[PDB]
């Protein structure tokens, strides 16, 4: 049970950051532009069993665009992403949508306005209506605060499985093993832990 998902939108909108958060849990603060596409499997556990997304995280910058719409072939779902702190990224939503549906004519698509965590929002709720005539689901999201960050995938899963009551569930957690500390690595740890204690945790002003 696996589905190809393409992720498109302007450079810097947070596509890769959002996927990474989902894959590993981390929040990457740096902007390293994607080169062509990055492909990563991503699994959720539902009340109907596991669902795998084959995530094609494509490049938004023209100069790094690679195969462009070539990446869209045989996609079964999509996320179009913009940045609510950048008007141009919303202005380009119809261009991404155009290029996407010319290749993928009848697929579920979520439009996502990312970075709603930032106070000075530039693309106002009132302005975001493009999704209505194109039958796209819409969510405000923040890869940084995790506002609504499950919603795009939960929605797509409900559409692809064809069950509107599908939920993400907790899978039971296996009992973890007892430990054996090698006295040969004893010192090894002292070092590695020394480095870790003296590297500051990020974002010490946040609520957690």
């Amino acid at each position: 049970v696996q589905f190809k998902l393409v992720l498109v939108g302007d450079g810097g909108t947070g596509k890769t950051t959002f996927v990474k958060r989902h894959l590993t849990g981390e929040f990457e603060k740096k902007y390293v532009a994607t080169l062509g596409v990055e492909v990563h499997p991503l699994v959720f556990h539902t009340n109907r069993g596991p669902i795998k997304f084959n995530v094609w995280d494509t490049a938004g910058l023209e100069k790094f665009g690679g195969l462009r719409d070539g990446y869209y072939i045989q996609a079964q779902c999509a996320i179009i992403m913009f940045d609510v702190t950048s008007r141009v990224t919303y202005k380009n939503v119809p261009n991404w949508h155009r290029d996407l549906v010319r290749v993928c004519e009848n697929i579920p698509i979520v439009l996502c306005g990312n970075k709603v965590d930032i106070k000075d929002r530039k693309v106002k709720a009132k302005s975001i209506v493009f999704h209505r005539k194109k039958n796209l689901q819409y969510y405000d999201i923040s890869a940084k605060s995790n506002y609504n960050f499950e919603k795009p995938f939960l929605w797509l899963a409900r559409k692809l499985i064809g069950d509107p009551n599908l939920e993400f569930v907790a899978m039971p957690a296996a009992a973890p093993p007892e430990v054996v500390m090698d006295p040969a690595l004893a010192a090894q740890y002292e070092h590695d832990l020394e480095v870790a204690q003296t590297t500051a945790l990020p974002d010490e002003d946040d609520d957690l």
């Binding site: 070539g70 072939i73 261009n95 004519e105 009132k126 999704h131 039958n135 819409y138 509107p164 500051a200």
Partner: protein, 995 residues
């Protein structure tokens, strides 16, 4: 092995390409990644297009052919015009032939839609280059080949759709103005024949796939074609009857009819009105008989999400709202149209019950339109009474919290209008929903909350007397609910909702002092409750009530010994004893609001003195101790206490502004001594521990003290009325305490808040302290520039605050830049251009504005040596830096301000407003106008930067640009035209004559 396709010295092994492509689309992990890179390098090879024929002929992988077509598209869209005519016709004929071949084979047509659609778009790209001037018979041949084959006819509809999109829907940014108009006129000239074909296919029918594709093209045509093609043929009737009855065509037809509803149409023609009514009548009839009756439960349908029901229902809401917003008046006068009007609205009511946020928003926009008009329009509401009654329930049951700012606003506005239209109906619905909460049948946290938000939203719509009776009923009812409920969780939810409602009804509070007093006292009781959310809601309700009712706390109410503000302050220690610091600050901020209602200076100052008693006394003790034992600042507890005192001051200063001065004066000297002592400690700790010290709790705590001090000063100065005191008392000690400390700390220890504070100082009193501004620049300019001029990412706060500070200095105290040494002024110019190159909108916009303001500042100086030297040294730097960010495709968000700057610079020369030559001697005949030399410089600069442009292109562009340098809109169009032309070869230089 896979890298072999990249070796062009050999012939291309198609089977290898097909392997690479398969490995990419169907492979995994490491293999997929390698193929990926290889395919990208293949595709981006500038000679790759030469292999397209071979791949399209001999590959058996449709993904390979798809990528081949991408390669060809790059050629067609960028370098087409370099090809000889015979080759262009060769390619054209190959693409056409491949499309027809694929369509004539039923198996391939069925199974290879991806490759065909890609081919069709490739063709459309060729039409954009070649048609009609180099291909006048394209449309006749397309029309002709349509009768040969149903598959070809169907595919031809996809081509015409894509053509229409490229010419009408997406041309604006992808083509020159002149080319867009050319292709628009060209499609217009031949549309008559195109429509004849579309109509015939619709009339004759049969193939649903063909019908659907035709209707898809029509939806695009409706963006631009004249109304007569719809209204003066049978096509309206076809759309609104036949094509609504079959579900294969219903979706596209409904979208078509929505766009039909938006056509430009004559207003004074009874036949057209009857046609507008009729197609609506037809469409709604087809829905009622073929899809679902008016009574259907659309909430349930949508929820079940069968087939394409969700999309269909979305599309129906869009059609009803679009049509009714424009045409409902057509249905309102004639009593034979009453049922139709009300049924259409009834469907909307049912759609409005669908649990789908974004669909709700679409219907809500319509309801807002309707109820607003019923509020104003004469002889109308009577029609919609039952609709409005249902809608009241729908809105009340869907009210969101006011934190959802836009949706709450929309919902409140609709409910307010509905309340005005029938106050009694609204009241009854609310009381009876409250009864359902009390009887347990509808009880839940969500439900009592939404009801409370709804009750709160309509505050101010009722008469004061109706409001009074309503409010009392609601409060009694909610108090009863609270009692009934068992357990702190439940009672806490109801209590918050009571707090909420009461806070939304200030008019009632203002008329009933005894009740207002009781509410505050009860909020104070709640400020001792540990249960989560209760203290926060108590404090938030307190300040909300204060914002609206403050006058009632500052006067002596009858049967009271004193103004309640006095009572609040007398007991403040006990009231706030269990609050978290943030809550305490809100409380003090609220008290500040009240105190500013007192306009007797002496009484105000004494109230302020009394409010600040506890923070001032703690301050006084620490001042002694902290100084005596500087180690005390190392005490975590001490640092926390100090920070909170400052924060308390900030909170009160926020609400009192100019009135806060006596309190700022009381602490000012010791506060700046504390700033210096904390600065010592920070420096001391960074010396002893390294840069890592800045991450420690102790140092972050010390810096918090510095930041809050800067915030307090910023807050006061931004609202101060007596600027003479600001300058005479506040500014000098401030600059002395903060500037050198900022300049002589290492980058990682410098607080960007310093810059922000200085921005406020210069904003408010810049003109009054010329020497202070000079001092600010000397302290912060070079050291900050050096922090942010190595990349675009380091020190983001400093970066933003830095350009805000330069902006205000260049606005208010330009003389400070005049007193800079030439070398420092050159750094200033470098700084401005640096901001241009930023993609961050904050920095970029300020960069452009400073540039613009600086030019104006220079212009003002008139014909003197500094201004003449400015132009000689920097005019060309500004012109070329601005062209750089215009043309590099990485700074599109700055386009408008870039254009404005560029226009101002070009106009300076076109008007002869620069007094000396811009060229250095013996570079050009010595009489030569700056106009001619500017033409020469730009032509040379653009030729070098864009060598594929002709001289004719560059000369026409500059000629247009200089002529248009007093008309921003046209200028901007010429710039955009240029941005299109630099992306291709062979752009028409006459495009710049567009008018």
């Amino acid at each position: 092995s896979m890298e072999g396709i990249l070796d062009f010295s050999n012939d291309l092994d198609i089977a290898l390409l097909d392997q690479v492509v398969s490995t990419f689309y169907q492979g995994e992990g490491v293999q997929q990644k390698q193929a990926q890179e290889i395919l990208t390098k293949f595709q981006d090879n500038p000679d790759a297009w030469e292999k397209v024929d071979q791949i399209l002929q001999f590959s058996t992988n449709p993904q390979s052919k798809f990528i081949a077509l991408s390669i060809l598209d790059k050629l067609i869209t960028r370098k087409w015009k370099l090809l000889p005519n015979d080759h262009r016709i060769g390619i054209r004929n190959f693409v056409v032939g491949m499309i027809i071949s694929m369509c004539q084979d039923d198996e391939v047509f069925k199974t290879q839609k991806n490759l065909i659609n890609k081919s069709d778009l490739t063709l459309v790209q060729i039409l954009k280059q070649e048609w009609p001037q180099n291909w006048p018979e394209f449309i006749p041949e397309l029309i002709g080949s349509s009768s040969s084959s149903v598959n070809v006819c169907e595919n031809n509809m996809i081509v015409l759709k894509l053509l229409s999109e490229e010419v009408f829907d997406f041309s604006a940014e992808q083509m020159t103005q002149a080319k867009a108009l050319h292709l628009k006129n060209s499609m217009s000239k031949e549309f008559e024949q195109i429509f004849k074909l579309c109509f015939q296919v619709l009339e004759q029918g049969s193939s649903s796939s063909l019908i659907v594709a035709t209707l898809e093209s029509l939806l695009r045509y409706l963006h631009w074609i004249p109304y007569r093609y719809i209204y003066e043929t049978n096509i309206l009737e076809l759309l609104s009857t036949k094509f609504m009855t079959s579900p294969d065509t219903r979706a596209i037809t409904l979208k078509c009819l929505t766009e039909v509803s938006n056509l430009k149409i004559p207003q004074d023609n009874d036949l057209i009105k009857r046609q507008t009514v009729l197609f609506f009548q037809n469409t709604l009839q087809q829905i009622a008989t073929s899809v679902m009756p008016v009574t259907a439960d659309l909430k349930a349908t949508y929820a079940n999400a069968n087939g394409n029901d969700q999309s269909f229902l979305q599309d129906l809401a869009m059609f009803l709202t679009t049509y009714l917003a424009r045409n409902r008046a057509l249905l309102e006068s004639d009593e034979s149209l009453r049922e139709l009007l009300l049924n259409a609205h009834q469907y909307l009511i049912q759609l409005s019950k669908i649990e789908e946020r974004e669909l709700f928003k679409t219907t809500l926009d319509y309801w807002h339109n309707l109820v607003a008009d019923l509020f104003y329009e004469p002889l109308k509401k009577h029609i919609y009474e039952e609709i409005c009654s249902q809608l009241r329930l729908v809105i009340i049951e869907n009210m969101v919290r006011p934190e959802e700012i836009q949706l709450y606003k929309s919902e409140r506005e609709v409910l307010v209008y509905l309340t005005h239209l029938n106050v009694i109906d609204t009241e009854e619905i609310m009381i009876s929903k409250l009864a359902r909460q009390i009887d347990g049948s509808e009880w839940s946290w969500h439900n009592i909350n939404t009801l409370s938000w709804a009750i709160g939203s309509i505050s101010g719509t009722m008469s004061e007397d109706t409001e009074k009776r309503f409010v009392v009923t609601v409060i009694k009812d909610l108090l009863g609910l609270c009692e009934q409920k068992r357990g702190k969780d439940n009672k806490a939810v109801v209590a918050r909702d009571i707090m909420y409602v009461v806070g939304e009804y200030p008019r009632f509070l203002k008329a009933h002092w005894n009740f207002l007093r009781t509410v505050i006292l009860k909020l104070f009781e709640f400020m001792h409750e540990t249960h989560e959310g209760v203290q926060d809601m108590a404090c938030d309700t307190f300040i909300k009530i204060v914002q609206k009712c403050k006058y009632h706390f500052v006067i002596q109410q009858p049967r009271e010994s004193e103004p309640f503000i006095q009572t609040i302050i007398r007991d403040i220690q006990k009231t706030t004893a269990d609050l978290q610091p943030q809550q305490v600050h809100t409380f003090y901020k609220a008290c500040g609001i009240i105190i500013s209602e007192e306009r007797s200076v002496a009484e105000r100052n004494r109230l302020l003195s009394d409010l600040m008693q506890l923070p001032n006394m703690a301050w006084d003790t620490i001042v002694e101790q902290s100084t005596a034992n500087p180690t005390l600042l190392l005490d975590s507890e001490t640092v926390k206490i100090i920070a909170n005192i400052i924060k308390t001051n900030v909170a009160v200063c926020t609400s009192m502004g100019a009135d806060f001065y006596p309190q700022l004066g009381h602490i000012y000297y010791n506060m700046l001594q504390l700033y210096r002592a904390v600065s010592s400690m920070i420096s001391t700790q960074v010396a002893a521990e390294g840069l890592i010290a800045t991450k420690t709790p102790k140092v972050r705590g010390l810096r918090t003290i510095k930041k809050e001090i800067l915030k307090l000063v910023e807050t006061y100065i931004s609202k101060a009325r007596n600027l003479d005191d600001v300058v005479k008392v506040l500014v000098e000690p401030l600059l002395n305490a903060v500037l050198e400390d900022y300049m002589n700390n290492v980058p990682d220890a410098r607080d960007a808040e310093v810059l922000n504070c200085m921005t406020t100082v210069v904003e408010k009193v810049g003109h009054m302290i010329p020497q202070g501004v000079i001092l600010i620049l000397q302290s912060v300019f070079e050291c900050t520039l050096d922090m942010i001029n190595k990349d675009f990412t380091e020190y983001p706060e400093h970066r933003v605050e830095f350009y805000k500070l330069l902006k205000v200095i260049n606005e208010k105290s330009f003389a400070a830049f005049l007193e800079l040494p030439p070398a420092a002024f050159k750094l200033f110019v470098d700084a401005i251009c640096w901001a241009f190159k930023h993609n961050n909108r904050d920095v970029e916009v300020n960069g452009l504005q400073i540039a613009l303001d600086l030019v104006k500042n220079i212009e003002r100086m008139g014909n003197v040596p500094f201004a003449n030297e400015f132009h000689k040294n920097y005019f060309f730097i500004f012109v070329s830096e601005t062209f750089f960010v215009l043309t590099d495709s990485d700074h599109k968000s700055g386009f408008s301000k870039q254009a404005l700057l560029l226009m101002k610079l070009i106009s300076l020369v076109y008007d002869n407003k620069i007094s000396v030559p811009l060229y250095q001697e013996a570079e050009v005949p010595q009489g030569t106008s700056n106009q001619v030399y500017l033409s020469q410089y730009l032509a040379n600069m653009l030729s070098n930067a864009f060598p594929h442009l002709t001289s004719e292109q560059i000369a026409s562009f500059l000629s247009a640009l200089t002529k248009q340098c007093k008309d921003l809109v046209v200028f901007k169009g010429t710039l955009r035209d240029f941005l299109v032309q630099i992306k291709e070869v062979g752009g028409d230089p006459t495009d710049y004559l567009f008018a």
